Design a protein around this ligand. Sequence first.
Ligand SMILES: [Cl-]
Ligand SMILES: [Cl-]
Ligand SMILES: [Cl-]
Ligand SMILES: [Cl-]
Ligand SMILES: [Cl-]
Ligand code: NA
Length: 129
Amino acid sequence: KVFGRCELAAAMKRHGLDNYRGYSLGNWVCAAKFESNFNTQATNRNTDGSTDYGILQINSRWWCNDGRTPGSRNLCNIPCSALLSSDITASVNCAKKIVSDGNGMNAWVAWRNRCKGTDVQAWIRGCRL
Ligand SMILES: [Cl-]
Ligand SMILES: [Cl-]
Ligand SMILES: [Cl-]
Ligand SMILES: [Cl-]
Ligand SMILES: [Cl-]
Ligand code: NA
């Protein structure tokens, strides 16, 4: 599923991501835009052989099991395929664990490089929330 900007903002809010660990909803929408272009089915292979999955490009090295990332962990206790669902519950729950891990949203390289320190509220501006 390819979410619209306000539609994703609404879903993220429903699943309790708005101000989670202090990150306003625009941070989450901005990160999703640059990680996946709002597409739940996005997958991208990394040089190390791990793969990133879903709307927030969660990586198989640490967070989910895809059967093909040697030495990896599955700290969200889910198959990486669960992260590609049209329903974002699994992605949200896993992102809550990731952003709690110590480095906040810096875990998401696209957030650090394209969202951090910008006007992230623009990503939610205009939305009925
Ligand atoms: Cl957009
Ligand atoms: Cl915001
Ligand atoms: Cl594996
Ligand atoms: Cl599994
Ligand atoms: Cl933080
Ligand atoms: Na894994």
